[PDB]
Design an enzyme around this catalytic site. Structure first.
Site, PDB file in Angstrom:
ATOM      1  N   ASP A  82      -0.826  -3.061   3.577  1.00  0.00           N
ATOM      2  CA  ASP A  82      -0.316  -1.733   3.126  1.00  0.00           C
ATOM      3  C   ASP A  82      -0.635  -0.596   4.114  1.00  0.00           C
ATOM      4  OD1 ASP A  82       1.161  -2.272   0.738  1.00  0.00           O
ATOM      5  OD2 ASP A  82      -0.651  -2.488  -0.446  1.00  0.00           O
ATOM      6  N   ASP A 122      -5.211  -1.251   0.566  1.00  0.00           N
ATOM      7  CA  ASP A 122      -4.184  -1.946  -0.202  1.00  0.00           C
ATOM      8  C   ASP A 122      -3.933  -1.124  -1.458  1.00  0.00           C
ATOM      9  OD1 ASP A 122      -2.665  -3.790  -2.066  1.00  0.00           O
ATOM     10  OD2 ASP A 122      -3.201  -5.365  -0.677  1.00  0.00           O
ATOM     11  N   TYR A 123      -2.761  -0.472  -1.504  1.00  0.00           N
ATOM     12  CA  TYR A 123      -2.386   0.308  -2.680  1.00  0.00           C
ATOM     13  C   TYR A 123      -1.915  -0.746  -3.694  1.00  0.00           C
ATOM     14  CZ  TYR A 123      -1.287   3.951   0.992  1.00  0.00           C
ATOM     15  OH  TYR A 123      -1.164   4.801   2.071  1.00  0.00           O
ATOM     16  N   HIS A 155       4.540   2.246  -3.627  1.00  0.00           N
ATOM     17  CA  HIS A 155       4.273   1.853  -2.230  1.00  0.00           C
ATOM     18  C   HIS A 155       5.167   2.652  -1.290  1.00  0.00           C
ATOM     19  CE1 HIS A 155       2.116  -1.570  -3.906  1.00  0.00           C
ATOM     20  NE2 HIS A 155       1.649  -1.806  -2.690  1.00  0.00           N
TER      21      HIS A 155
HETATM   22 CA   LIG Z   1      -0.193  -3.568  -2.329  1.00  0.00          CA
END
Ligand SMILES: [Ca+2]
Lengths: 538, 713, 181, 246, 289
Positions: free
Chosen positions: E182, E195-196, E71
């Site tokens: 994210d 959304d990673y 992230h």
């Molecule tokens: Ca995430």
DNA sequence: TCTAATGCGAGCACTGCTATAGCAGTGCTCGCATTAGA
């Protein structure tokens, strides 16, 4: 040094921290060769193996223990014996030492001590001077009638009553129970005044159980009423009744049943709890897997049975019973031979067939075994089946039909414990622990057929059993027993294995195998580590 | 909102009291502003490992590590096994250091013994080879780790290897960038992350990273030592504050923070004590700015005094103020924070209670102060909190206590019915006598007060006292009576690490030998080597089964390297009665230290049974109710009254008094040797010795101990 | 950034064992036994000096020379001891003439004792040989040439002040160094 | 003694599974059971598993809310505080028990295992007297008990009536640590040279007089001290009465 | 002893709290979400004998410490320009990972940058700063308790995914709803939710296909996350964009399981959804009534 | 189930001598105060 490799071997779950830490501290600063031995010694140790044959260590393990990986393994080294002995965490047995090299066997000192303790026990038995063969013979003639054609149970008794320690080995088809019974009636009968306390015992409590409910039954019968301060009808598991030398047990005669389960340590521990003046009678099955797997002793003790009695002993037995008893082959290991005696089934018309014939057959040859499938179509008892290809699914079926009763008591919600007594009616057994065969694998591949249709130890209730290793079934029985041999391979599938499997069945018995695996089994015979053999030939 | 100067020190208590009556009485709370360090297991655990290189590896300190679940999990050790490791570590001899290198590196003479490697060796050694068999590389094996359990020794040993691998690796300075990966490596090496600790673990790596990065930034040439880094991490970890629940699941407990003044209906301040609230810290003093001040300048004093104002200003409904009025020890008086003084001083000087309208500045002011100050009670169960009015407690839990509505503990002993199973092992007539009260607890109602752990010597042995000197004397003795080689025993003992180093060990040995020899001789001088004898005595409707060792054709010849005692007499008398009833006609001697000696005359198998019966009578009564009879005190009293001449049981007042003394000297010892009655078993029946029960003992222990004195020598 | 150490009793004890370890373990049986007879172990040392070691160190009236080693003093002592152990391995003559009442012939009890006080030393200790001295010999024609006993019972014969002095000087700085580190 | 019991109790809670370790906790005097009680609970296997659940219930509270909260639960059930207070000297015990729990609670917030805490208790029970914080708290009421204090803790204190039962005792100084009469520095004589022990001994009553002066001085209205023809010299009453050394 | 104790007559009733898609994720996260507010909470565990001597993104250290390392990577990048490998060796070196990961990682980052999220243009690499907003943080008041049941019904109706019905695993909550997104970026008219998800070590490729993902999606009931997150983006956009309409500006929700992403095997590793617009509606007012 | 402090002199008993009684010294039994105090 080897540190990385070993520690790695632990990451790869191929040996435990204890083995390498043991290895490291004891050798560590020696030729990595000796370092490796210790690791592996402690490793086989962990599997119950008493010692580690220099042989399982000389070029063969290049296809055995996965650590045939090395930059340090300088050749076949041959002088393994030398390298070891040089390192001084190994000694021939003089110096106090972590390891012992006796035979071409490497031992953890404790083991080698425990072995010798057992050898000494059986090469120190003295003669129960309690002779007056004249009288013994009479009390035996009176307890054994059909002694016209050599009565082996009559012999067993005579052996046992003229020796301090004695082993009686027999198959399930024998009156080992009834023999130990007359055996003692005669001990009691011959006790002039008094002082003869007889205590029974088995290694597992499930066994101890049966000892009494059959050693009593058969015992309250037979003509004996001169006050029955019997066998103290309290058995006790062997690992109860102790907890020792320096506080020997209170008894004159100890009768250990299921002796095939006594392991090296258990032996030496029981031995010590024994006061010089006591008599021990062991009962067991010499060719049962428990007598041959890692750490056992019965198998090796009874090995010398095939050696027969010395001539002098033979003559005496034949004098004691009213029948000529064979001998033969000089006197090597005389003290052991002369106090062993294995039983044989006796005479009747018809058969013992089904489980009977196959079992006997299995304790030997092919031609015999193949000709019992063909023969009489024993329909019920035997049920060989051809497992290969998709007939694996054929088996899954006759497998859900076997567990029939069980699955219906479930459905029919009869939730009592007949569900319990229903399960011990059918049972799958397999040599392997993991696999398409074996346990782990068999439970799944079966649970699937049944959704898409619908204390100490080894007490059932889905430990996801459904299938068991022939090994864990020891000391149990079921009506219908099915055995599943691998598709094609393994040394784990031996003659003893198969034998003890068949002997688990009381009625029907299926054997899903191939006339290659089965016959290959019949011919292989569980490897036997140990030094006892040699400790007995001197 | 609830604020304290130091939220870290109130935390324990906050949590405790808010663990209360589930229904009714319960209200939610969250503590904010706590220090990451002080509030997380692993953080300290990790700062601790960062010091391996400076550690002396004391036993309890290594073992403590295993109290951190995540670490214990990493080496496959469960609370279950930890229990054994703990026992083994203690018994194998481990005390101090890891290696010999370690010891050496401490400029201390490497002794080879008492380090982890030593004990660990003894246990691995003991895995293979058993204790007897002998010493190996000057090391005697330790056999508690022998079976499957040995598997544990492995895990443990693996843990100690890892620790050593790191104590040496963290040893030398490194260039900044080199320290970069150590942190993330030590974590995975010693902790098997939970789900919680995963967060905590990440927190370390951040701080550790940021620290090093910041150095690299400034391009720090030279190499840096671990301490420099470990200390910065420690500090950084102590300033990191966790206050993520600061306004959800209500009732906020925290410290007064600068620049965080929020309106609350309720505002309470705790422990606003002198010396505690306006929080302090003097500027560095070489801080030019602090001596020549200017309008912008800031200081904790001002921030802190201004926060007490912001408090007053932000409370919209009620302001709650609290402080501690006096330490609960020296009972000396406390004092509130001048800031709180000022607050009630200005209230008092500007208000008056309705009643007092015409009395006085000073007079009315006091009453208002006295009216708003509410002294509270020391214990929560003092009645005043349960009367009616100003804060009666909502805690019914303490009501009964408050109202003395309890029921005094009922006298313990209530006669239990008991039927004697014909046939009791000798051992049970042995275990019963030689401290009968204990017996009622252990035998009758299987209560054994086992205490889990035991002091692990904070050091190798320099001296030999108590139980050890006894266990060593025990064998030295048997070995001299057996006329065996003491020298062999000495090397085993030295091999176990039981003696004090070098010459000191030898010297200690040489002397036990001497005293021990002197006893061995009185024994050697009259031992007539015999054998066991099995017991199967029919006596008073019960059999007795067991072994009587070494039975000589003279009688029994016993011995112990211990002083003479009544309980040891009784011990031999029991043995005597049994062997004399077994037929055998002969004597029985017990040779003790300082020439003690209990000697019993031969007894007719008929009278032997009569005597062996009161003994069984005792065991029988003593299984229904604790049978008194304190061998030491009883027999102390009993020894001063009884006379050999005419078997004179004295009653003159001169002696019935010296008696009552000896009994008591015995009942509650000196300041050194220490007293019979100081014993959980007795302590559980009565905490103080009453003159009534002293009697029961005397009479009772007279009844069973007399024969001992009517027959000695 | 200082950390207010609170205990110091354990810090002191540990320093005291370190002292003993590095100053006694390496010692040879003859000296070791001597020390042992003065203190059985470090706990007993501390018991004798713990008071000092705390706060201002007292001045020692008459300290040992800023260098005597255990080794040295021992020598001097042993040597003072054996020279009198020789002039007694010759009790050939001591079997004397002229009397007194107190002095009995149960002196043959006193005699052998010291005659047999001829071990290979190892202890500065020496049970009473009061009579066979010479200072009182006269105080009770009278005696000969073992006026070397008048001399042995003058000089203290002990390792005490020497070890003690060394301990507190050292135990203090151990404590100190530890507290700095 | 109350600590020992708390230790058994905790062991019990952390594992009521082990028949034995629970029986021990139920046996502690703190729980107030009977010999008749212990017995009958040993014969009633259904009642036992009931106490076992009760105890599994405590471990749960412990695991979630803390040792204090668990202990308070336990106490409210076995109605401990109420009963204890009724039992003579039972206040001492009860407040000590609470005190242990307050300590037990801090120590817990620095350990992430219950077992660790147990272990934390054992340690403190085997090697105590550490801080002033683990010192015994005095009960509110000790205020209406005659108060027995040492000459030292009495400096500062005032009392209406005081007793000096053993004000004549002495104890001769035998260690030669004395102050030089001219330089006023402290001198340790490592050879008990009589001149210095003599100087040390003087310094000894030089001190007892100060102690006597503090002793006589605490009273307001009255004071009575005990005096005796004390002798220590094993010299057969030679007109001795070395009372003049106090 | 004339005593008694005050008993209160008020009652528990309702509880106001601040939750955040934790109504879901059972504890263990106790103090987890507390010590590190942005830990890759979605990961967890160990890793074993899956070492295969040729580094692939599937053998990248498993769990949260490493997870949130990733992230971190995408927090401040230049999606625009190419991936410096030096930069990357530094990220790995600073975060305490072996440098020798740079080859595999830099090759991994670009692949994932140059993938086609919604076929039409798309690809993170086409997003300049001005069109991204990283880690946005929202607070949604949620009055009128939110009953796990009542939310289940409509979640079911409008979502084919949440038709895998085990839900309603939480309990009544009035209060607030915290949350981090994210990435939210725009593609000329049209805002998105990215959304990673670094996640699990499920051997290889075989585990990052449109089903398996859709699978895991339900295992962790991440579907709940979408709907919540977009109700957030919805509200936020509606508040910012004066006169905005949900279906003229939205069309987002991308889910990159970072692993399982190759330069040439699209639709593997990536997942897309576009909440019913009729769901958001009800959902939005399911909060306020 | 484990062990359980020293140490100092007295105190009385007894045993050589030698200018019965006093001066001395050998030896086992026993009672006594020991710590302190923050
Ligand atoms: Ca995430």
């Amino acid at each position: 040094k080897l540190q990385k490799q070993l520690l790695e071997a632990v990451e790869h779950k191929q040996l435990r921290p204890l083995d390498v830490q043991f290895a490291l501290t004891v050798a560590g600063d020696e030729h990595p060769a000796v370092t490796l031995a210790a690791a592996l010694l402690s490793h086989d140790a962990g599997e119950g193996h008493v010692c580690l044959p220099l042989s399982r260590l000389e070029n063969n393990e290049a296809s055995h223990p996965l650590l045939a990986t090395c930059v340090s393994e300088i050749g076949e080294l041959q002088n393994w014996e030398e390298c070891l002995l040089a390192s001084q965490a190994v000694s021939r047995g003089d110096e106090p030492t972590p390891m012992i090299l006796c035979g071409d066997r490497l031992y953890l000192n404790r083991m080698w001590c425990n072995e010798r303790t057992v050898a000494r026990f059986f090469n120190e038995v003295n003669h129960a001077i309690e002779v007056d063969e004249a009288l013994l013979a009479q009390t035996l003639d009176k307890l054994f009638p059909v002694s016209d054609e050599i009565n082996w149970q009559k012999v067993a008794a005579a052996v046992a009553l003229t020796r301090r320690i004695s082993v009686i080995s027999g198959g399930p088809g024998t009156g080992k129970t009834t023999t130990v019974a007359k055996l003692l009636a005669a001990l009691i009968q011959m006790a002039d005044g008094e002082r003869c306390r007889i205590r029974l015992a088995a290694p597992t409590g499930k066994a101890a159980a049966r000892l009494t409910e059959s050693l009593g039954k058969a015992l309250r019968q037979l003509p004996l009423t001169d006050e029955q301060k019997k066998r103290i009808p309290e058995d006790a598991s062997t690992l109860h009744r102790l907890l020792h030398a320096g506080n020997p047990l209170h008894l004159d005669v100890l009768v250990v049943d299921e002796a095939s389960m006594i392991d090296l340590p258990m032996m030496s521990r029981l031995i010590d709890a024994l006061p010089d003046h006591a008599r021990v009678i062991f009962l067991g099955d010499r060719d049962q897997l428990a007598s041959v797997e890692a750490g056992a002793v019965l198998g090796d003790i009874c090995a010398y049975a095939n050696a027969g009695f010395t001539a002098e002993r033979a003559r005496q037995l034949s004098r004691l019973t009213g029948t000529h008893v064979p001998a033969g082959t000089g006197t090597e290991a005389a003290s052991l031979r002369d106090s062993l005696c294995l039983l044989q089934k006796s005479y009747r018309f018809g058969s013992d067939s089904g489980i009977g014939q196959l079992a006997a057959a299995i304790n030997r040859g092919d031609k015999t075994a193949v000709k019992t499938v063909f023969q009489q179509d024993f329909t019920d008892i035997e049920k060989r089946l051809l497992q290969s290809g998709e007939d694996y699914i054929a088996m899954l079926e006759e497998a859900l039909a076997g567990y029939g009763r069980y699955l219906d008591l479930l459905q029919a919600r009869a939730e009592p414990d007949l569900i319990i007594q229903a399960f011990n009616e059918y049972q799958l057994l397999c040599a392997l622990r993991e696999g398409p065969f074996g346990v782990a694998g068999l439970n799944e591949r079966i649970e699937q057929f049944m959704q898409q249709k619908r204390q100490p130890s080894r007490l059932p209730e889905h430990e996801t059993t459904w299938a068991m290793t022939v090994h864990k079934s020891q000391g149990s029985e079921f009506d219908h027993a099915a055995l599943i041999l691998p598709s094609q391979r393994t040394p784990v599938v031996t003659r003893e294995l198969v034998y003890t499997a068949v002997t688990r069945a009381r009625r029907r018995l299926s054997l899903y195998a191939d006339e290659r695996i089965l016959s290959a089994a019949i011919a292989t015979r569980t490897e036997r580590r140990s030094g006892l053999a040699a400790l007995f030939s001197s | 909102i609830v604020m304290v100067a130091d939220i870290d020190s109130y935390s324990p208590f906050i949590q405790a009291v808010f663990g209360s009556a589930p229904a009714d009485r319960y209200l939610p709370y969250a503590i904010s502003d706590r220090r990451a360090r002080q509030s997380h297991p692993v953080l300290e655990a990790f700062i601790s490992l960062l010091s391996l290189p400076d550690s002396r590896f004391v036993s309890e300190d290594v073992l403590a590590l295993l109290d951190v679940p995540v670490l214990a999990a990493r080496f496959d050790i469960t609370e279950e096994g930890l229990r054994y490791l703990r026992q083994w570590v203690n018994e194998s001899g481990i005390r101090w250091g890891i290696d010999d290198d370690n010891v050496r590196e401490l400029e201390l003479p490497a002794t080879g013994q008492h380090t982890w490697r030593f004990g660990l060796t003894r246990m691995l050694l003991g895995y293979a080879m058993e204790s007897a068999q002998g010493e190996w590389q000057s090391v005697l094996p330790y056999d508690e780790s022998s079976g499957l359990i040995a598997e544990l020794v492995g895990h443990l040993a693996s843990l100690l290897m890892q620790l050593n691998i790191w104590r040496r690796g963290l040893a030398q300075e490194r260039p900044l960038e080199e320290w970069l990966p150590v942190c993330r490596d030590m974590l995975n090496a010693f902790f098997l992350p939970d789900a919680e600790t995963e967060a905590a673990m990440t927190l370390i790596e951040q701080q550790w990273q940021a620290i090093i990065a910041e150095g690299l930034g400034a391009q720090y040439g030279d190499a840096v030592p671990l301490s420099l880094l470990r200390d910065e991490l420690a500090q950084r970890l102590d300033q990191e504050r966790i206050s993520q629940r600061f306004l959800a699941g209500p009732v906020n407990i925290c410290t007064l923070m600068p620049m965080r003044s929020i309106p609350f209906k309720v505002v309470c301040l705790l422990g606003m004590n002198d010396g505690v609230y306006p929080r302090q810290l003097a500027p560095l003093g070489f801080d030019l700015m602090s001596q020549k001040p200017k309008r912008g300048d800031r200081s904790r004093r001002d921030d802190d005094r201004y926060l007490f104002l912001e408090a007053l200003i932000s409370a919209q409904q009620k302001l709650y103020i609290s402080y501690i009025g006096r330490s609960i020890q020296d009972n000396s008086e406390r004092f509130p924070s001048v800031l709180v003084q000022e607050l009630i001083d200005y209230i008092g000087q500007s208000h008056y209670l309705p009643g007092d309208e015409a009395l006085n500045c000073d007079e009315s002011e006091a009453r208002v102060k006295a009216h708003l100050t509410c002294l509270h009670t020391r214990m929560p169960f003092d009645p005043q909190n349960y009367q009616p009015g100003e804060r009666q407690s909502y805690a019914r839990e303490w009501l009964p206590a408050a109202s003395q509505a309890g029921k005094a503990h009922s006298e313990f002993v209530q006669p239990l019915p008991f039927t004697l199973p014909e046939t009791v092992p000798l051992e049970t007539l042995q275990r019963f006598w030689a401290h009968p009260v204990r017996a009622f607890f252990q035998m009758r109602l299987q209560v054994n007060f086992r205490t889990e752990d035991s002091e692990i010597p904070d050091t190798e042995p320099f001296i030999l006292e108590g139980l050890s000197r006894y266990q060593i004397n025990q064998q030295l003795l048997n070995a001299l009576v057996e006329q065996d080689d003491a020298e062999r025993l000495f090397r085993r003992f030295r091999a176990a690490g039981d003696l004090p180093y070098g010459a000191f060990g030898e010297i200690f040995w040489e002397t036990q030998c001497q005293e021990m020899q002197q006893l061995a001789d009185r024994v050697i001088a009259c031992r007539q080597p015999g054998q066991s004898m099995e017991i199967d005595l029919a006596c008073n409707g019960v059999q007795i089964t067991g072994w009587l060792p070494q039975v000589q054709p003279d009688g029994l010849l016993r011995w112990r390297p211990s002083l003479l005692s009544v309980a040891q007499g009784m011990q031999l008398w029991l043995e005597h009665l049994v062997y004399c009833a077994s037929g055998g006609n002969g004597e029985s001697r017990l040779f003790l230290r300082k020439d003690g000696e209990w000697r019993f005359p031969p007894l007719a198998a008929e009278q032997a049974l009569h005597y062996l019966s009161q003994l069984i009578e005792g065991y029988r009564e003593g299984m229904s109710a604790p049978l008194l009879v304190l061998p030491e005190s009883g027999g102390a009293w009993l020894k001063t009254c009884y006379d050999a001449q005419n078997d004179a049981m004295l009653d003159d007042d001169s002696t019935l008094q010296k008696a009552r003394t000896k009994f008591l000297q015995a009942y509650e010892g000196n300041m050194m040797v220490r007293g019979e009655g100081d014993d959980i078993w007795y302590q559980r029946l009565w905490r103080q010795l009453t003159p009534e029960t002293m009697e029961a003992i005397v009479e009772q222990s007279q009844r069973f101990l007399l024969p001992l004195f009517r027959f000695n020598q | 950034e200082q950390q207010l150490i609170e205990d110091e009793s354990l810090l002191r004890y540990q320093a005291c064992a370190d002292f003993w370890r590095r100053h006694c373990y390496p010692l040879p049986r003859e000296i070791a036994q001597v020390v042992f007879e003065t203190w059985k172990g470090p706990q007993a040392l501390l018991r004798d000096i713990n008071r000092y070691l705390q706060g201002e160190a007292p001045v020692i009236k008459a300290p040992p020379p800023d260098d005597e080693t255990l080794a040295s003093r021992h020598a001097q002592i042993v040597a003072r001891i054996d020279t009198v152990k020789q002039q007694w391995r010759d009790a050939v003559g001591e079997l004397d003439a002229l009397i007194e009442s107190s002095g009995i012939d149960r002196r043959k009890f006193n005699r052998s004792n010291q005659a047999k006080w001829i071990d290979k030393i190892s202890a500065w200790a020496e049970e009473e040989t009061n009579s066979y001295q010479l200072p009182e010999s006269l105080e009770k024609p009278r005696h000969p040439l073992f006026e070397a006993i008048d001399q042995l019972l003058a000089e203290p014969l002990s390792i005490r002040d020497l070890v003690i002095t060394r301990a507190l000087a050292e135990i203090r700085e151990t404590v100190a160094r530890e507290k700095r580190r | 003694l109350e600590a020992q019991e708390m230790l058994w109790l905790l062991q019990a809670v952390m594992t009521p599974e082990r028949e034995n370790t629970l029986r021990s906790a139920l046996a502690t005097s703190m729980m107030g059971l009977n010999a008749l009680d212990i017995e009958t609970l040993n014969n009633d296997e259904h009642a036992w598993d009931v106490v076992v659940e009760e105890f599994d219930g405590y471990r749960q509270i412990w695991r979630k809310r803390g040792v204090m909260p668990m202990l308070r639960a336990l106490m409210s059930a076995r109605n401990i505080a109420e009963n204890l207070l009724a039992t003579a000297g039972g206040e001492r015990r009860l407040t000590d028990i609470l005190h242990i729990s307050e300590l037990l609670q801090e120590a817990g917030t620095q350990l992430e295992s219950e077992h660790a805490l147990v272990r934390w208790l054992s340690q403190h029970i085997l090697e105590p007297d550490s801080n002033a914080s683990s010192q015994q708290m005095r009960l509110e009421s000790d205020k209406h008990l005659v108060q027995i204090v040492t000459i030292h803790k009495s400096k500062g204190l005032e009392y209406p009536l005081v007793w000096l039962p053993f004000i004549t005792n002495f104890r001769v100084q035998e260690q030669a640590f004395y102050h030089d009469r001219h330089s006023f520095e402290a001198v340790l004589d490592l050879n008990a040279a009589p001149e210095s022990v003599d100087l040390a001994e003087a310094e000894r009553l030089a001190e007892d007089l100060r102690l006597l002066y503090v002793a006589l001085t605490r009273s307001v209205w009255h004071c009575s001290l005990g005096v005796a023809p004390l002798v220590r010299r094993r010299g057969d009453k030679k007109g001795d009465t070395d009372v003049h050394q106090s | 002893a004339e005593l008694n104790a005050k008993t209160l007559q008020r009652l528990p009733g309702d509880n106001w709290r601040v939750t955040s898609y934790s109504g879901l994720q059972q504890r263990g996260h106790g103090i987890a979400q507390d010590l590190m507010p942005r830990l890759d909470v979605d990961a967890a565990g160990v890793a074993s004998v899956v070492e295969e001597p040729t580094l692939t993104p599937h053998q990248f250290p498993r769990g949260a410490s490493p997870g949130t390392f990733l992230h971190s990577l995408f927090e401040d990048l230049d999606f625009t320009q190419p991936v410096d490998p030096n930069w990357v060796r530094e990220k790995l070196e600073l975060g305490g990972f072996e440098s020798q990961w740079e080859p595999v990682l830099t090759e991994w980052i670009t692949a994932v940058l140059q993938a086609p999220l919604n076929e039409t243009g798309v690809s993170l690499s086409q997003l300049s700063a001005r069109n991204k907003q990283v880690e946005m943080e929202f607070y949604l008041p949620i009055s009128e308790p939110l009953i796990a049941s009542q939310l289940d019904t409509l979640i079911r109706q409008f979502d084919p995914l949440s038709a895998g019905c085990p839900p309603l695993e939480f309990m009544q909550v009035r209060g607030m709803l915290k949350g981090f997104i994210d990435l939210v970026f725009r593609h000329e008219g049209r805002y998105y939710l990215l959304d990673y998800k670094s996640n699990w070590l499920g051997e290889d490729s075989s585990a990052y296909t449109q089903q398996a993902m859709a699978a895991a999606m339900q295992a962790h009931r991440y579907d709940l996350q979408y709907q919540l997150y977009t109700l957030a983006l919805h509200r936020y956009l509606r508040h910012r964009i004066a006169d905005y309409d949900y279906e003229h500006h939205f069309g987002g929700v991308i889910y990159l399981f970072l692993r399982g992403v190759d330069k040439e095997h699209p639709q593997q590793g990536i997942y897309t959804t576009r909440p019913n617009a009729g769901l958001i509606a009800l959902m939005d007012e399911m909060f306020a009534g």
